[PDB]
């Protein structure tokens, strides 16, 4: 039982994410591809990918990594600025971090949005072959139809949603909905489960809600059911997940 | 001695960032006065006319480092700044202290790569306190006023014998329209034409690969000796003195 190592399935990258592997080695698998992120690297994750991850911590007492997830505004603006300025391998990218680059990582302030975008802009100008990055930021700024489905469901995550309700709200047929979600490699039940499990993951890391509270917040009747669903979904228990990232 | 120079009627043709790497500088413009010490960054709004008194710290070296943005650079930088932040003399000329880490960014600037260069400026601006006056001046200096239109018409043939009639014809307007539109911006036609010819002459001189006689014919002035008189009258220093100071 290696506390320094964990394997997690069905990770959805909800926001475009920049990740610095401050305390881990990370193997990312998705679609039979494999990307290794070594120690002390910057990692760029396209918004919307589902990945499995194998993580190895060098030091147990700290978090595996440091991440920067960009909200909806931040992303689009960053697309806007990047345009005015300028397969999995094109969705996930790792780079080594300099003292100059890392020092800017150190100063990033999540509150000052302008300051944050300028920092990211600076960081991207310094990278070799930065088009792969510019593509994913731009690609992951367009809202697909499943984003629309997601946004409808996020408003009331506790509701008993159905493919009927969704197709009604879109003035379309059920087959239109599922076939449109098929063209984006997902389906309605996957979106809903992936939304509840993403939220639950974040709620767990806050350490200020009980499991039964968490399940009720994401709309699941029983705490013991939620724990079973979480383990089936991620491949670890809520407890195991929390201890690794705590 | 001769390490100090005073130059009059400098027009900031492009928006300019200037690092006073080797000088102290007094800037007089709009009947105001701004002292920039050694090791400061200076932000100069496009279109200001200034007079400068400079004192070099080290005689053998050039007085300062400058970055002038052409039209593309400027508007692109405006576009990005508006996307990132949203939509009197003190607000046109601004000097700031630059950190050592930021100083390395001064060192890091490469003028040949546009994308890299704009990003760095955005980074430099985010790191500054009260950077709205800077954002203001950049945005203010991105619009083309009517005198920019006149300048752009004149630039097509700097040697031509321009007149207010020719200008007014080329705009399908009356001479009164032209002079009164140029008045509402505190300028007139003769001032635009003379400051255009002296800006160009100044830059050709620093190239050191054109003769005075060549330079005078390129900007549209009959004689080399006349051009030398006009340059001295305009800048308050001779072409040789001006060249030697920056050489």
UniProtKB/Swiss-Prot annotation, chain A:
This is DNA-binding dual transcriptional regulator Rns. The gene is rns. Decanoate binds at residues 14, 69. Homodimer; each subunit binds one decanoate molecule. Keywords: Activator, Cytoplasm, DNA-binding, Lipoprotein, Plasmid, Repressor, Transcription, Transcription regulation, Virulence. Disruption phenotype: No longer expresses CS1 or CS2. Has been crystallized in an open and closed form; both bind decanoate which changes position between the 2 forms. PROSITE patterns: HTH_ARAC_FAMILY_1 (PS00041), HTH_ARAC_FAMILY_2 (PS01124). It comes from Escherichia coli.
């Amino acid at each position: 039982e290696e506390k320094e190592t964990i394997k997690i399935n069905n990770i959805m990258i909800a926001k475009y994410t920049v990740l610095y592997t401050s305390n881990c080695i990370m193997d990312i698998y998705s679609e039979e591809e494999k990307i290794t992120c070594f120690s002390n690297r910057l990692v760029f994750l396209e918004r919307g990918v589902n990945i499995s991850v194998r993580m190895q911590k060098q030091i147990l007492s700290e978090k595996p990594y440091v991440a920067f997830a960009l909200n909806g505004d931040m992303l689009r603006h960053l697309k806007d600025a990047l345009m005015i300025i300028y397969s999995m391998s094109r969705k996930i990218m790792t780079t080594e971090v300099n003292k100059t680059l890392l020092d800017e990582l150190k100063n990033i302030n999540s509150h000052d949005n302008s300051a944050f975008i300028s920092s990211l802009i600076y960081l991207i100008s310094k990278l070799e072959n930065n088009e792969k990055i510019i593509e994913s930021i731009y690609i992951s700024s367009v809202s697909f139809f499943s984003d629309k489905v997601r946004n409808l469901i996020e408003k009331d995550l506790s509701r008993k949603w159905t493919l009927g309700i969704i197709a009604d709200a879109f003035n379309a047929s059920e087959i239109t909905i599922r076939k449109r979600l098929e063209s984006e490699n997902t389906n309605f039940n996957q979106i809903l489960m992936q939304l509840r499990m993403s939220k639950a993951a974040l709620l767990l890391l806050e350490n200020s809600y009980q499991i039964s509270q968490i399940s009720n917040m994401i709309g699941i009747s029983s705490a013991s059911y939620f724990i079973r669903i979480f383990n089936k979904h991620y491949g670890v228990t809520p407890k195991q997940f929390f201890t690794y990232f705590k």
